Write an enzyme that holds these catalytic residues in place. Structure first.
Site, mmCIF file in Angstrom:
data_model
loop_
_atom_site.group_PDB
_atom_site.id
_atom_site.type_symbol
_atom_site.label_atom_id
_atom_site.label_comp_id
_atom_site.label_asym_id
_atom_site.label_seq_id
_atom_site.Cartn_x
_atom_site.Cartn_y
_atom_site.Cartn_z
ATOM 1 N N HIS A 171 7.824 -4.077 14.252
ATOM 2 C CA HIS A 171 7.427 -5.092 13.284
ATOM 3 C C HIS A 171 8.455 -6.210 13.247
ATOM 4 O O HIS A 171 9.447 -6.181 13.976
ATOM 5 C CB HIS A 171 7.354 -4.477 11.880
ATOM 6 C CG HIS A 171 8.690 -4.078 11.325
ATOM 7 N ND1 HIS A 171 9.390 -2.978 11.775
ATOM 8 C CD2 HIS A 171 9.469 -4.654 10.377
ATOM 9 C CE1 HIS A 171 10.540 -2.893 11.130
ATOM 10 N NE2 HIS A 171 10.613 -3.900 10.276
ATOM 11 N N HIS A 205 9.837 -9.622 10.289
ATOM 12 C CA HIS A 205 9.737 -10.174 8.949
ATOM 13 C C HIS A 205 9.506 -11.673 9.047
ATOM 14 O O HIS A 205 10.284 -12.397 9.669
ATOM 15 C CB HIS A 205 11.011 -9.835 8.179
ATOM 16 C CG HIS A 205 11.257 -8.363 8.086
ATOM 17 N ND1 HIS A 205 10.501 -7.535 7.284
ATOM 18 C CD2 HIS A 205 12.094 -7.552 8.778
ATOM 19 C CE1 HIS A 205 10.856 -6.280 7.488
ATOM 20 N NE2 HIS A 205 11.822 -6.262 8.391
ATOM 21 N N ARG A 253 35.592 -0.408 -13.168
ATOM 22 C CA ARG A 253 35.706 -1.558 -12.281
ATOM 23 C C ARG A 253 35.765 -2.658 -13.340
ATOM 24 O O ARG A 253 34.777 -2.927 -14.029
ATOM 25 C CB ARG A 253 34.460 -1.726 -11.411
ATOM 26 C CG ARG A 253 34.386 -3.077 -10.699
ATOM 27 C CD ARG A 253 35.548 -3.297 -9.729
ATOM 28 N NE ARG A 253 35.449 -4.600 -9.067
ATOM 29 C CZ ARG A 253 35.937 -5.737 -9.555
ATOM 30 N NH1 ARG A 253 36.577 -5.753 -10.718
ATOM 31 N NH2 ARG A 253 35.769 -6.870 -8.887
ATOM 32 N N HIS A 300 31.134 -13.258 -10.534
ATOM 33 C CA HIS A 300 31.327 -13.958 -9.271
ATOM 34 C C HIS A 300 30.273 -15.023 -9.075
ATOM 35 O O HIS A 300 29.311 -15.104 -9.831
ATOM 36 C CB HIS A 300 31.318 -13.024 -8.049
ATOM 37 C CG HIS A 300 30.986 -11.598 -8.347
ATOM 38 N ND1 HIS A 300 29.723 -11.187 -8.711
ATOM 39 C CD2 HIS A 300 31.743 -10.476 -8.283
ATOM 40 C CE1 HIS A 300 29.716 -9.875 -8.857
ATOM 41 N NE2 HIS A 300 30.929 -9.418 -8.605
ATOM 42 N N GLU A 349 17.085 -9.688 8.029
ATOM 43 C CA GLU A 349 17.171 -8.336 7.479
ATOM 44 C C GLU A 349 18.596 -7.807 7.635
ATOM 45 O O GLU A 349 19.162 -7.842 8.729
ATOM 46 C CB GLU A 349 16.214 -7.375 8.204
ATOM 47 C CG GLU A 349 16.318 -5.919 7.711
ATOM 48 C CD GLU A 349 15.376 -4.963 8.437
ATOM 49 O OE1 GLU A 349 14.165 -5.259 8.505
ATOM 50 O OE2 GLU A 349 15.843 -3.910 8.930
ATOM 51 N N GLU A 371 37.886 -12.636 -1.788
ATOM 52 C CA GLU A 371 38.710 -12.548 -2.992
ATOM 53 C C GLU A 371 38.500 -13.745 -3.915
ATOM 54 O O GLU A 371 38.639 -13.631 -5.132
ATOM 55 C CB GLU A 371 40.194 -12.449 -2.609
ATOM 56 C CG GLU A 371 40.639 -13.465 -1.558
ATOM 57 C CD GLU A 371 42.108 -13.327 -1.172
ATOM 58 O OE1 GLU A 371 42.623 -12.190 -1.140
ATOM 59 O OE2 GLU A 371 42.742 -14.359 -0.879
ATOM 60 N N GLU A 419 24.613 -10.039 -7.299
ATOM 61 C CA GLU A 419 25.009 -8.707 -6.852
ATOM 62 C C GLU A 419 23.877 -7.699 -6.986
ATOM 63 O O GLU A 419 23.253 -7.596 -8.038
ATOM 64 C CB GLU A 419 26.207 -8.234 -7.677
ATOM 65 C CG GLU A 419 26.682 -6.812 -7.388
ATOM 66 C CD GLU A 419 27.838 -6.416 -8.288
ATOM 67 O OE1 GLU A 419 28.805 -7.204 -8.389
ATOM 68 O OE2 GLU A 419 27.790 -5.320 -8.894
ATOM 69 N N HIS A 462 34.194 -8.497 -14.894
ATOM 70 C CA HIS A 462 34.360 -9.631 -13.995
ATOM 71 C C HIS A 462 33.041 -10.347 -13.738
ATOM 72 O O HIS A 462 31.989 -9.943 -14.236
ATOM 73 C CB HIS A 462 34.895 -9.126 -12.649
ATOM 74 C CG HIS A 462 33.914 -8.275 -11.894
ATOM 75 N ND1 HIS A 462 33.728 -6.934 -12.157
ATOM 76 C CD2 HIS A 462 33.023 -8.592 -10.923
ATOM 77 C CE1 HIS A 462 32.764 -6.463 -11.385
ATOM 78 N NE2 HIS A 462 32.317 -7.449 -10.628
ATOM 79 N N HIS A 514 11.532 -5.821 15.967
ATOM 80 C CA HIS A 514 12.375 -4.633 15.960
ATOM 81 C C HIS A 514 11.657 -3.362 15.523
ATOM 82 O O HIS A 514 10.507 -3.394 15.080
ATOM 83 C CB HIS A 514 13.604 -4.854 15.062
ATOM 84 C CG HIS A 514 13.275 -5.168 13.633
ATOM 85 N ND1 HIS A 514 12.677 -6.349 13.245
ATOM 86 C CD2 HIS A 514 13.485 -4.463 12.495
ATOM 87 C CE1 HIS A 514 12.535 -6.358 11.931
ATOM 88 N NE2 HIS A 514 13.019 -5.225 11.451
ATOM 89 N N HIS A 560 29.922 -8.694 -15.784
ATOM 90 C CA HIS A 560 29.534 -7.292 -15.809
ATOM 91 C C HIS A 560 30.693 -6.339 -15.547
ATOM 92 O O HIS A 560 31.809 -6.757 -15.233
ATOM 93 C CB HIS A 560 28.445 -7.047 -14.767
ATOM 94 C CG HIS A 560 28.798 -7.549 -13.398
ATOM 95 N ND1 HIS A 560 28.616 -8.863 -13.020
ATOM 96 C CD2 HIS A 560 29.330 -6.918 -12.324
ATOM 97 C CE1 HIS A 560 29.016 -9.018 -11.770
ATOM 98 N NE2 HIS A 560 29.454 -7.853 -11.324
HETATM 99 MN MN LIG Z 1 12.569 -4.554 9.346
HETATM 100 MN MN LIG Z 2 30.491 -7.388 -9.445
#
Ligand SMILES: [Mn+2]
Ligand SMILES: [Mn+2]
Ligand SMILES: [Mg+2]
Ligand SMILES: [Mg+2]
Ligand SMILES: [Mg+2]
Ligand SMILES: [Mg+2]
Ligand SMILES: [Mg+2]
Ligand SMILES: [Mn+2]
Ligand SMILES: [Mn+2]
Ligand SMILES: [Mn+2]
Ligand SMILES: [Mn+2]
Ligand SMILES: [Mn+2]
Ligand SMILES: [Mn+2]
Ligand SMILES: [Mn+2]
Ligand SMILES: [Mn+2]
EC number: 4.1.1.2
Lengths: 372, 372, 372, 372, 372
Positions: C266, C268, C85, C90, C273, C155, C94, C88, C312, C133
């Site tokens: 529960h 958050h 890959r 961004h 999430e 993109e 990530e 590159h 949830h 990376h």
């Molecule tokens: Mn959860």
């Molecule tokens: Mn990447």
């Protein structure tokens, strides 16, 4: 009263609201120094819908009522003796000031630690966003002011315990707790929100012990216990994250202004100011820069607002003490006093700006006096 | 000049601006490698309205001029000897670079502590949002670049001392200071903004002592005193919150590029880059990803911009040194050098990407050289 | 299957998608407790365009597919043995989870320090925004899930090394590295993105030494090595900034639910999430407050979402283990268990809310059990 | 030139752009009557990237260059003899003015009716949104101004014929036309946009006959043929939907101002005004209400703008004729003349407003004279 | 008064605004049928800043006061005898209702045609956006309600004649009219806005004749002259573009409700309703769909609002007649009566919906009675 100032203005010729005109002397007849378009910075709880329940009531002032206040909203809640504000949680952080009576609050954090405590007149509480809590009034009942750190606060902001269970499949609830559907057949079909209940017992008897230990910091704060900043015309009690540790998104100050006194000319270098008038009557002129300024009148209920960095003062225009709250969505309280500012600059430099002499600069004080 | 590149383009047939075409060689005739829609990243102070006052002038480039720069705005201010930029404050933080002359600045913080200091060519100052300050040019006069951390900076961003007082009821001002309305009858009726004044005396004589002590950190910084990052083609002086402590929302770098040199190919992994060209002439190609790239020309005045993470370089295309400022709204300066990046990866891996051999990877350097 | 529940609903009379109806039992026939308008919280990678390249493929689920997820986007990437890959970077941070195979990653920080390491099944990596990376699959090839901290990921978010060079004037590249235009004449004319390549050698042989030293913290994390939170119905492996130091904007949890078990009720208290279902089948009801709740079905691929603070649970409705990821854009993982919450409050107080007796409160546990 | 007006302003002390300062006399030294923050209303095509192709070039001024113009964008296109602007269509309506040369345009409507015609200097064309068209320069080549009714006009606004086919499966194209994939194997792999081509033959020989008949209204208009509104200082040619029938979203006026003349003080009661300066030099002050006004200089290229209802005038400050276009996104041209307005009111009423006498009201004219 | 309804609510324990609580009986104690979050739909002119001038005053209610009203804003203006509201124009269309006194208005259209007329109590005027106009009170003075078709109406919406001239270079004004700078040296230095003036003479003597002829349609309308829709409980006078031709963006209705009567249950299928209460006291419940409804109280001044399609009624809760205006930003008035709707459907079908019998459907009327 008539909208007349010297040779400006005229008498009102159409049907009018004389009662409100009497409450807004400085709006019907503003200072000659007011000028330009300025957003509304005042709204009364008495002009809002009151949600009545068995056990009390609640009314709110949000961005839907006061557009300028996009970051803070408020609820005036009243609970009868023993009445419970149902266990719930919301996306917003919650700050409160107990104006009348007392109540017991509960809160459990994300580590399973619980905090239960009683709050009396002059006390505060702060519940971090998302942490579940409850309120139950004691023998005198209770009436307090809640402040949430999002002006869009609404019905979609709060999650009630019984509402959650009422909208969860019975088989899932059963499985979650390890019981049969029959054992939970009596669960409420709708939320309670506020409900009447017998007065609780002593606080010490309600304390719950757990395997996770005590919470690191208290969620309640005795504001009136601390020594206030005492000025010649009044006093100021401040509570922000530096002293009320958990209150990270709300900084507050309880200001008391004696008759004939005023919160001095100042501004806040950190964020917007949200106000609630507990008692008394006042007037404040907001200086919005570029020759824009507007004066507003406030009393009892009334919510006020001062956008970030705008210059202002709060003058007591009544015969009784003026008491109000200054709220800020920040981790600290900060203000710049006009008097102190000029007092800390070279005398001739200030004189060059104001076209005034030593007689004026001589009265400037290097010490900050919030209320004069 | 004509918009012709090889067999592409054609001569201009309609009335045109030959002077501007000559200033933008790489825009009239862009590199063959330019491609796609890219927002404008250039604007000249000479193309803005100049506010003239008794004592100097001021012109600005904001988001209303350069739409891409939503987070930063700038003012080019000029003060005659002794002229004062009236005591004021704003919602935005302020950073400055003294290009010509010198001036004395004052600032008082939220704790009533004052800081007064003289700033010369190559020096900076940073005033946190909301803190009141002033500027007074010394014997040579002064001309500097101001950068505010909000692209929407405008007239409603600044609060002038005399404007505030001019729009506050006389009786309130009197009560605030404990004087009579008669004693302040000479206060200005309108703001001053910039006004002529006698040169001040020695700095040591202006220092004001107070009961709150000295400020924890200086609001001025001598940028040219520190040792710069010296490369073969120029030098870089950096000032961010790691060395100029109070400058928390603005990181800066003064770059000097000798004739025949260039600020190397790089990008910033933290935020957008705002530029001001002090002297010289240059060209920069901004790589906006997905096969989009556009080249711009810059000289003297000119404001430039490089959106977050876009690849770029700044080449000196003139016979004189190229000097410009790189400004970032962040608490630190950070960049990734293309050369250093590839130099720190396995040789064959880089070769696999570029379809080049050892002859190329052999020239890569593990040490960062900002200007080559 | 037919949309019939007791005496409600009816048979479908028009042409329909029986296959999808079979996959969504709880959507075709929702629980009687579901109510109100709730945004879509489910999307399948199988319903997205698959970008095929020589060496693998990549498909994404972004805000353009799942509108509710404005802060997080994801890519399902597959690399053949040795496939790369392309180098590159961004604007977004990530995070990744290796589901199948293994790969070698490289990353160089803003200080010129490089980190190269191999990642196997169950391992993670986190690349801070803007840091360059690469990824190269090893002998088994690789297939992983990438999560970017901006739902608008597209993109225009990614900058490829060869794309940058392809859009930079040859003379500038030459000058930047100190070579001739002829020496770089073989540079690619277009980006590679994903390309076939020979398998690399041993990791130890790829390690590059530099004058800047080693990186302070690793960019990879062996999630399955740590001891998980083991409950009666499954286990939870958590990785946030408290243990995987560099992962400041992404907190994650790998949840395994055995057949007949469920992730307990529960919510958050910190943020939204984002979910990815690795294997198995499930159903989850999201409680959105004010009597609003909607149930969704999930399996294999499928991306799920739970807006901030909504209640949830995640129930395994299949015969095989249920395995999914819970992702949060925050520096820590946090949750409030309904069971633990009620267990830490006075028994009679809980009874007063639920209209249930001691028989129910007796089953509450003060210890948190994520999966029951 | 120096930014000095009487006792205001000062000389420039830092490196500057003298060439641009000379082009903006009224910006470097604005009228004493200018005041307040006003958005930039000027931008030069010479300050934009020029896209060069085999056959001509094109440069644009959009909202990304001039933020105030959100509803209109423009392209300056140049075609060599015989060169073709590839068959295409866009979401926006297109209006054009042929400044130099001539060209043949084609357009087919939604009913399959075609219109082909030649356009010379002074002629216009208007292509409704979505209708496909083309342009091919004749023997002298061509250079014209295009105006699109959306300021966000960009690369994603235009669809090219060959680009569409290049991104459509070959088997689908084959099936669509009833041919084999082999028969269309020579279709272009990429769009052409602008390409060189042999000059076309006579117009009459290009006319295509169809079963749907002729279009109801022409898509071209000979603006200079009509009799203009002739004033003492110049002339005005207007083309809106009342005379150029198809031009429903664009109203236009070609204004010629002789040396020593000016487009009178006026405003538009319908919408914003977009301007393009064909030749000459001018200055215009825009009155934005509430004591806000800013003066701008314009010449050759230059794009100008006057927000809806703002007062303005356009004065020729050169020795040659001033020629510019006034464009409005509306179905009609409309303006209110200050002179005519006051001339049509009771004399004493106007005198009461201006504090002037009969000597002034005597010069007012009830007839509108656009250029004096 | 206390917020108590049956066994719900409680007495107020904190300082309160008893006067306002008395004005809002149905807000302090809402109907049991009220439910859910509903935006504020009420605001009093008495709660706004009153701009006082020599000759009268003006106060406004805009989106900055009442957020729900984004499309309409209003000004309550008062002029002393002979006082003039300075010649001006704005971006918004203007509609007005003369509540007290009378005034003479002037307006000139884009074709140079003037219209001058006197307006008395009960009359209206409508000035299309951008067309210049003025107002001068007659011998009794005047007080009227202005409605502008943009809720954001502010200081930047209005352009005053003298303000324009005060901010235009003297040399340009001179050149525009063909006079010397000396001849216009007495022009005002600042706008007048509202100024005292001698009463004008007879209307016939003010009429100005021009070469462009008379305007096609009148800009004033005698609303009370037409026959109203007379119901058993009151009357309705409607003026929209079908009868008051020029009023294209504002449709209006003057409603009079006798004591003991009510504007029936209905809704508007076209747009939002803006209200102004001229006299009397009322209460209205707004039905916002999905079980949401809120009741509001209104009196004298007060501005009200009913979002598009929401169900509502307006009940007189006082001893005097209730008189209010219903304003709509549309070219026509339209409403759907609940009674008429059900009356025009099959009887058994209505019975099936309401679970009521023939006794109820028998009272339905096919004729619309606005006030019952
Ligand atoms: Mn959860
Ligand atoms: Mn990447
Ligand atoms: Mg003023
Ligand atoms: Mg390319
Ligand atoms: Mg329900
Ligand atoms: Mg002015
Ligand atoms: Mg209901
Ligand atoms: Mn709460
Ligand atoms: Mn304050
Ligand atoms: Mn400043
Ligand atoms: Mn850079
Ligand atoms: Mn076109
Ligand atoms: Mn015009
Ligand atoms: Mn008007
Ligand atoms: Mn209605």
């Amino acid at each position: 009263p008539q909208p007349i100032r010297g040779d400006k203005g005229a008498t009102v010729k159409i049907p009018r609201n004389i009662e409100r005109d009497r409450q807004n002397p400085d709006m019907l007849v503003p200072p000659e120094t007011d000028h330009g378009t300025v957003s509304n910075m005042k709204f009364s709880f008495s002009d809002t819908h009151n949600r009545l329940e068995k056990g009390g009531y609640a009314r709110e002032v949000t961005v839907r009522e006061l557009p300028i206040s996009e970051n803070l909203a408020s609820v005036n809640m009243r609970l009868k003796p023993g009445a419970i504000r149902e266990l719930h949680w919301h996306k917003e952080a919650e700050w409160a000031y107990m104006i009348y009576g007392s109540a017991r609050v509960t809160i459990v954090d994300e580590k399973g630690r619980s905090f239960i405590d009683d709050v009396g007149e002059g006390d505060l509480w702060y519940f971090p966003s998302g942490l579940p809590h409850s309120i139950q009034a004691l023998e005198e009942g209770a009436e307090f002011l809640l402040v949430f750190d999002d002006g869009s606060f609404s019905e979609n902001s709060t999650f009630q315990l019984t509402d959650w269970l009422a909208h969860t499949p019975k088989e899932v609830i059963a499985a979650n707790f390890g019981v049969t559907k029959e054992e939970i057949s009596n669960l409420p079909g709708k939320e309670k929100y506020i409900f009447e209940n017998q007065l609780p017992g002593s606080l010490k008897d309600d304390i719950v012990e757990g395997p996770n230990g005590e919470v690191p910091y208290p969620f309640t704060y005795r504001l009136l216990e601390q020594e206030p900043i005492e000025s010649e015309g009044g006093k100021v009690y401040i509570a922000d994250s530096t002293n009320f540790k958990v209150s990270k998104t709300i900084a507050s100050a309880l200001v008391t202004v004696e008759p004939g006194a005023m919160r001095e000319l100042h501004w806040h270098p950190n964020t917007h100011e949200w106000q609630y008038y507990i008692s008394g009557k006042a007037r404040m002129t907001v200086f919005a820069s570029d020759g824009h300024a507007r004066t507003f009148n406030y009393q009892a209920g009334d919510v006020g607002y001062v956008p970030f960095a705008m210059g202002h003062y709060v003058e007591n225009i009544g015969d009784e003490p003026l008491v109000f709250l200054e709220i800020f969505k920040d981790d600290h309280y900060a203000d710049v006093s006009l008097n102190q500012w000029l007092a800390m600059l070279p005398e001739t430099f200030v004189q060059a700006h104001l076209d005034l002499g030593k007689d004026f600069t001589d009265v400037l004080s290097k010490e900050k006096h919030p209320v004069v």
